[PDB]
Amino acid sequence: GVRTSPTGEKVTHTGQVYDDEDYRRVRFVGRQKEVNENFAIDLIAEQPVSQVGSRVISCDGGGGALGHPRVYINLDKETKTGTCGYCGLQFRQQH
Amino acid sequence: LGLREIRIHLCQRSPGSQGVRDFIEKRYVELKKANPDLPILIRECSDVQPKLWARYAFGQEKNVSLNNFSADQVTRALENVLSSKA
Amino acid sequence: TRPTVRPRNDVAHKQLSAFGEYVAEILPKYVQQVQVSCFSELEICIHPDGVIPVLTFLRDHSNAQFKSLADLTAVDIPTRQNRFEIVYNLLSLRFNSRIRVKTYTDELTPVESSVSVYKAANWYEREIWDMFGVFFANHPDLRRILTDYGFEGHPFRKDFPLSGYVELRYDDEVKRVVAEPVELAQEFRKFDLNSPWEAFPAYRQPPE
Amino acid sequence: LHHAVIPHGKGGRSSVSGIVATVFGATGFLGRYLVNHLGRMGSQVIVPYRCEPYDTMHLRPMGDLGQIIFMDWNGRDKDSIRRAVEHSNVVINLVGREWETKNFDFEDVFVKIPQAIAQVSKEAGVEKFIHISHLNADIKSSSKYLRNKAVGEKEVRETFPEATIIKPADIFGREDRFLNYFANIRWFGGVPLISLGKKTVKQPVYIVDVTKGIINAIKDPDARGKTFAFVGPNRYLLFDLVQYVFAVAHRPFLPYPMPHFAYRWIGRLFEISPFEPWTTRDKVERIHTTDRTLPHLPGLEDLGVQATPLELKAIEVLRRHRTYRWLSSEIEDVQPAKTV
Amino acid sequence: TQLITVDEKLDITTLTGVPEEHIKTRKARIFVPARNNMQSGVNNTKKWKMEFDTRERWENPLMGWASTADPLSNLVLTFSTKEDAIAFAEKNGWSYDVEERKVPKPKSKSYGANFSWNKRTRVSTK
Amino acid sequence: TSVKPIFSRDMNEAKRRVRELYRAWYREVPNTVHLFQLDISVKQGRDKVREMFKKNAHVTDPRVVDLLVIKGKMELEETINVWKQRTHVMRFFHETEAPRPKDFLSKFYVGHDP
Amino acid sequence: ILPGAAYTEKSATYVNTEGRAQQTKVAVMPPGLAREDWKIIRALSEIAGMTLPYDTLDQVRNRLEEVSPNLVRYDDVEGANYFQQASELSKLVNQQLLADPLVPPQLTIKDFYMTDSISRASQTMAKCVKAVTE
Ligand SMILES: NC(=O)C1=CN([C@@H]2O[C@H](COP(=O)(O)OP(=O)(O)OC[C@H]3O[C@@H](n4cnc5c(N)ncnc54)[C@H](OP(=O)(O)O)[C@@H]3O)[C@@H](O)[C@H]2O)C=CC1
Numbered sequence A: 001g002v003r004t005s006p007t008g009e010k011v012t013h014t015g016q017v018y019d020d021e022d023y024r025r026v027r028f029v030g031r032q033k034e035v036n037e038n039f040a041i042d043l044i045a046e047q048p049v050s051q052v053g054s055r056v057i058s059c060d061g062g063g064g065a066l067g068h069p070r071v072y073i074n075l076d077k078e079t080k081t082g083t084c085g086y087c088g089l090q091f092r093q094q095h
Numbered sequence B: 001l002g003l004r005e006i007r008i009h010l011c012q013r014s015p016g017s018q019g020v021r022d023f024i025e026k027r028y029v030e031l032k033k034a035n036p037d038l039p040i041l042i043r044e045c046s047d048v049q050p051k052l053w054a055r056y057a058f059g060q061e062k063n064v065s066l067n068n069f070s071a072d073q074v075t076r077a078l079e080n081v082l083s084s085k086a
Numbered sequence C: 001t002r003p004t005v006r007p008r009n010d011v012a013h014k015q016l017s018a019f020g021e022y023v024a025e026i027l028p029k030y031v032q033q034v035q036v037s038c039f040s041e042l043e044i045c046i047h048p049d050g051v052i053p054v055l056t057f058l059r060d061h062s063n064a065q066f067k068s069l070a071d072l073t074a075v076d077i078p079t080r081q082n083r084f085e086i087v088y089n090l091l092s093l094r095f096n097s098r099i100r101v102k103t104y105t106d107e108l109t110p111v112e113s114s115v116s117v118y119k120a121a122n123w124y125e126r127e128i129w130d131m132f133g134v135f136f137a138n139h140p141d142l143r144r145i146l147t148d149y150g151f152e153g154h155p156f157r158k159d160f161p162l163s164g165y166v167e168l169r170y171d172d173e174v175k176r177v178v179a180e181p182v183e184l185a186q187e188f189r190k191f192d193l194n195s196p197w198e199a200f201p202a203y204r205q206p207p208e
Numbered sequence D: 001l002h003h004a005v006i007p008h009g010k011g012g013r014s015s016v017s018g019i020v021a022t023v024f025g026a027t028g029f030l031g032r033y034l035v036n037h038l039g040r041m042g043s044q045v046i047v048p049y050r051c052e053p054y055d056t057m058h059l060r061p062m063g064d065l066g067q068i069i070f071m072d073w074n075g076r077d078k079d080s081i082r083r084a085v086e087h088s089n090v091v092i093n094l095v096g097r098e099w100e101t102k103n104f105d106f107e108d109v110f111v112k113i114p115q116a117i118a119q120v121s122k123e124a125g126v127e128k129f130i131h132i133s134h135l136n137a138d139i140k141s142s143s144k145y146l147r148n149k150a151v152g153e154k155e156v157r158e159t160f161p162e163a164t165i166i167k168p169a170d171i172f173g174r175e176d177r178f179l180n181y182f183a184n185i186r187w188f189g190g191v192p193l194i195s196l197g198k199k200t201v202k203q204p205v206y207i208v209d210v211t212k213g214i215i216n217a218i219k220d221p222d223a224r225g226k227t228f229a230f231v232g233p234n235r236y237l238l239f240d241l242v243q244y245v246f247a248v249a250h251r252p253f254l255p256y257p258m259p260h261f262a263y264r265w266i267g268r269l270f271e272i273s274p275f276e277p278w279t280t281r282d283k284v285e286r287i288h289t290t291d292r293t294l295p296h297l298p299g300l301e302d303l304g305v306q307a308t309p310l311e312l313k314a315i316e317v318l319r320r321h322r323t324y325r326w327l328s329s330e331i332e333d334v335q336p337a338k339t340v
Numbered sequence E: 001t002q003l004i005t006v007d008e009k010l011d012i013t014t015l016t017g018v019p020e021e022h023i024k025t026r027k028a029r030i031f032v033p034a035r036n037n038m039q040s041g042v043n044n045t046k047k048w049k050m051e052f053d054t055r056e057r058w059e060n061p062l063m064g065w066a067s068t069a070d071p072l073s074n075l076v077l078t079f080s081t082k083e084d085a086i087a088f089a090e091k092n093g094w095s096y097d098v099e100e101r102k103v104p105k106p107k108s109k110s111y112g113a114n115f116s117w118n119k120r121t122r123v124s125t126k
Numbered sequence F: 001t002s003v004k005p006i007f008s009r010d011m012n013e014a015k016r017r018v019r020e021l022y023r024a025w026y027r028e029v030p031n032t033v034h035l036f037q038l039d040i041s042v043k044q045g046r047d048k049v050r051e052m053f054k055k056n057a058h059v060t061d062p063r064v065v066d067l068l069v070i071k072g073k074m075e076l077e078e079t080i081n082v083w084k085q086r087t088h089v090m091r092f093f094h095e096t097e098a099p100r101p102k103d104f105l106s107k108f109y110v111g112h113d114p
Numbered sequence G: 001i002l003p004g005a006a007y008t009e010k011s012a013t014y015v016n017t018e019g020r021a022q023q024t025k026v027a028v029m030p031p032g033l034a035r036e037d038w039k040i041i042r043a044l045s046e047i048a049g050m051t052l053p054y055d056t057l058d059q060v061r062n063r064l065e066e067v068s069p070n071l072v073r074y075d076d077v078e079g080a081n082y083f084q085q086a087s088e089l090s091k092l093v094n095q096q097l098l099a100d101p102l103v104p105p106q107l108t109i110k111d112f113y114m115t116d117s118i119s120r121a122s123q124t125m126a127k128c129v130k131a132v133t134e
C-alpha cells in the first residue's frame, strides 16, 4: 500500500518523503529509493479477530519460544477488542 | 546632560554599611519627596562594599566609594551627585 | 555455596599474610600498607622514594627471589592529589608466587627508573611515559612508543577525551596527509548505566 | 529558505556549509582544486563527468560521505544538464580544452556548451552562475581560443544577466600546462621563442589563489554581475620568465630566436597527433601574447585574496623536472626573476 | 636537602596538549547530580561530577545522525569531595561553577497521625 | 611546599636549558628544510621555531618548564633522525586549515560558539 | 524579525517571586540562524556604532552585578528591609479604590494551560483544553 508524492517519490510507512525544494533528492538521481512496499499495519489489520470464551487470554505469538514473551489480555470491555501488545493480534470475548 | 538614575548598593550586616543604613532609615523618605521622578534604587546584598552609582545622559556612569562612612558624609556625597548633573 | 560460588584458598591467604608481615618488618623505611585480597593476592604499597630498594630486595633476597617482572602499569585516579598510581607485578619462579608493589606520583614529581633491576621496565615505563606523562628519571632511552609522531598530550589520562583533538585526512592541494580538528559524523552516545541502588553492603563507605 | 540549507558546524569536513554546487568539467585542472576547497567546508558537490569513473577516482576522497554525487552528462544534451542543475543553487562552468578534436571544435567547448549550461541554469532557477573565461579574450585576437572565449563570454553575459565572469591570466600549479610546458620543451632542443621572447609580458597567477577567489565569489553577494580579472602580483617578460623556469629546474638554458611563420609550421606538425598534442599553433599564439591590463575590473584584492608570487611556488611546481644532482637544492639559491 | 621551595600557582595547561580554544572558552560545572525522580534510590548522588557546557549538535546530511565538533562533549569526571574537584579544575586552567549539594531535610513521619482525633491529618481512606 | 625537582633547582638553570635547546633548534632548521625537502624558506622555519618557543613564555615554575625542555629535546631528537615524515614536520604549519573568526561579529555570524 | 533563543537553548539568569536568582543551562542549541538574545543586542550595538563593553557571558554578568549585586549570587535569598519607608511613601498619593470586585483572570482549569507563547503553541495543551472544556 505504498503512496507516491506529487514529485514522483514514494512514501514509506514512517511517512517520510522529500519536499520539492529539498536538495537531498539529488541522491536519488540516476538511482532509486529503496522502499519496502509490505506495510505491516495493513497486513496486521487484515487478521481476523479471535473469539474466545474466557475473561482473560494468553498470547505468545505462535510457535512458543519462537514468539514474544507470553502476555495476558483482559476481555472485560464489550466495546473494544483486546489487542496483544507485541504481535498486535486482537481477541474478543463472545459475551 | 543631566542625571537619570541613582543606585545605592549596601549590606545589611556589615559595619561598613552602617552609615548608609542610617542615612536611608532617617532621610530617604524626604529625599524621595525632594526628587519624586528620579529613580533611586536601593539594593541590599550580603558581602558587598557600600557603593554609589550615578547614571548620566548617554550612558555615562560615575562611581563613589561609600566605605566606612557616617550618615552625614553619605548625604553630602548624595547632594554633591545631585547638584553636579554632569 | 557449592556449585556456583568460587572456593577460597585459606592456606595461600595465611602464607601471603605471613610474608607480608615479613616484608613490612624487614623494610620499615618505605612500606606504608600491606594488604591481602580475598582471592589471595598481596599488595605492598610503599613510598615512591623507595622504589629501587624494595624491588632490589624482592629480586635478590633468598626468601623472595621474585626474578620476573611480569607487568608494569599506571592507573589514573583524578580525585587524589597524587593522581597517578604505578603498579609493579612480580613473579617468583623458585617459590611460585606473585606479588604486587604499588606507589604513587603526580604529573611533576619524577619517579626513579627500575631498569637496574628488570630490563623489561625500559619499554614498560617508556610506554607509561607515553600514555600518562609520568617522567622516569635516569632512563636510558625515554621517548614515545605507541602514540603518533607529532602527537601532543597523553591519551590515557582521564581528562583526555575518548576521541582526540585532531584527525588525519589526505589533502590534494598540498598532496599530503594533514591533521585537522576532529568532527565526528555521529557523536559517541554516552550511556548512563549506573543503578541508583546499592549492590554490595560490604564495600559501603561511611558517611560524612 | 530551506531548513537543510542553513549552515551548521564549524566549517570542517562533516559540517554543512549550505552550498549546493554543480561544477562542470571537474575532472580537469582547476576542478580538482575547486572540488577540494568545496568539500573541506562541507558542501554538497555534484560532479557531472564525461570520462571514465576511474578518472573520477582521484576526486572521490575529496569530501565526506554523500557530499559528492557523480553522474553522466553530454555537452550536446540539454536534458542531462537539466538533470544535473535542477537541485543545485550554485553552478560553476570550467569547461574548456586547449585544442580542437575530431568531435568538438573551439566553438562547441567555448560557445555552445556554456550557453546551454547558462540557459538551463536560468530556466531551473539557479541564483548563482559562474563562468571561467580568459583574461586576454579578444574578438580580434589571432588564435581561435581567445576569439571563441570572448564570444562565449558575451553569450553567457547576454543569457544570464546575474552571471559572474572570472578572467584568469595564466595558471601555474603542480599539474599545470604553463610551467610544465616550458620545463618539458627542453627535450626538443633549446627553447625557441619569438623575437627572443622580450616583446611579450606575462603575469601568471597561482591556482590556490584562483580557487580562493572563486570560493569567495560564491560566498560574496556583491559578486553577482561583476566581471573579475584574476592576475598575479608581478609582471615578467617571457625571456626571463623562461630563464627563471630553467634556473629553478637547474637545466642548461640556450635560447635562440625563431620567426613567427617558422613557429606556426612547427605547431602544425605537433598538432596532427591523434592523442593530446604536445603543442599547437593556438598554444603558440597564446604563449607569445602579452597579457592586457584592465584597471577598471576588480581583481583578487577585492575578494580578500592576497596574491602569492611565483618565487614561492615555482620550486614546488618544477622540482620534479630536476636531475638527481640538483634535487635537494633549497629555496634561495636561485636568482629571482626581473620584473618590469 | 634535595627539596625545592616552589611558591607559584600550579598549572599543567602547557603539558596536557589541549588547544587554547578548549581551555579558555570552556566552562566546567562541578555538581552533585540530582536524584532521578523516577526512582527512590539515592546511590547515584554520592560523588561529585565535573562536566562541560553543551555546544552545537547538528543533523547529518546523509543519514540524519547527530554530528558534533566538541571533543569534550561526553567527558565527565568523578570526585570524592568538592575540594578535589576544585583543585583539579584549577590545575588544568578551567573556569568552574560550583553548585552546593542539596540533601533532604529529616521529616517527621508517624503512623498514628493518620488516625488523629482532632487534627486535619486524618486520611480519607487507607 | 618543598617538592622534588626534575633537573633544575631554580629558574636560572631552567632558562639555561631553554637557551641551549633553542640554540640547537636554530642549528637544526636548515638541515630540517634540506633533508625533508620542504618548500618553505629557512627564515619561515626559524620564525616558526621562535613562535613555538614564545607560545610558552608566561610560565615561571621550574618543574613544568623542565618538562617542556624534555619534550622539546625529544622532538629535536625525533627530527635529527628521519623519524618524522614531511607531514609531521609541516603539521606545525596549519596550511590546510581555514582561518577562523577572530572578532565578535564574525563569530556571531558563523555560529553559536563563543 | 530577529530569531532569539529559548530557556532550554541558552544559559541565562531568572529571578523568581521570592528574590532568589537562578541560572539556566544550555540543553540544546537554537535552530536555524537563531542566536542568543544578548549576543543579538551586542551585535546590534556593534553595527550601529554604539558598541557595548562586553563580549562574553561573564562580562555581561559582571555588568549585571554592577547594576545589581544580587543578580549574580545564585541559590541565595537576600533580605529586603525598610518596609516602614515604603509604607510612609505610599500614603502620599490618595488613589481612590474602584467599585469593581476582585475577579482573577484564571477561574477554571481551562484558563491554566494557555498563558504564554510556548504553551499556546503546544498540542498537548490544546488536547488538555479540549478535554477539560467538554
Ligand atoms: N591555462 C589555464 O589554466 C587557464 C584556463 N582558463 C579556463 O579555465 C577553464 C578550465 O581549464 P583547465 O581545467 O585548466 O583545463 P582542462 O583541460 O584540464 O579541464 C577542462 C575540463 O573540461 C572538460 N571538457 C573538455 N571538453 C569537454 C566537452 N566537450 N564536453 C564535456 N566536458 C569537456 C574536461 O573533461 P575530460 O577530462 O572528460 O575531457 C575537463 O574536466 C577552461 O575553460 C579554460 O579556458 C582560463 C585561464 C587560464
Ligand SMILES: [Zn+2]
Pocket (backbone or CB within 6 Å): A059, A060, A061, A068, A084, A085, A086, A087, A088, A089
Ligand atoms: Zn501476541
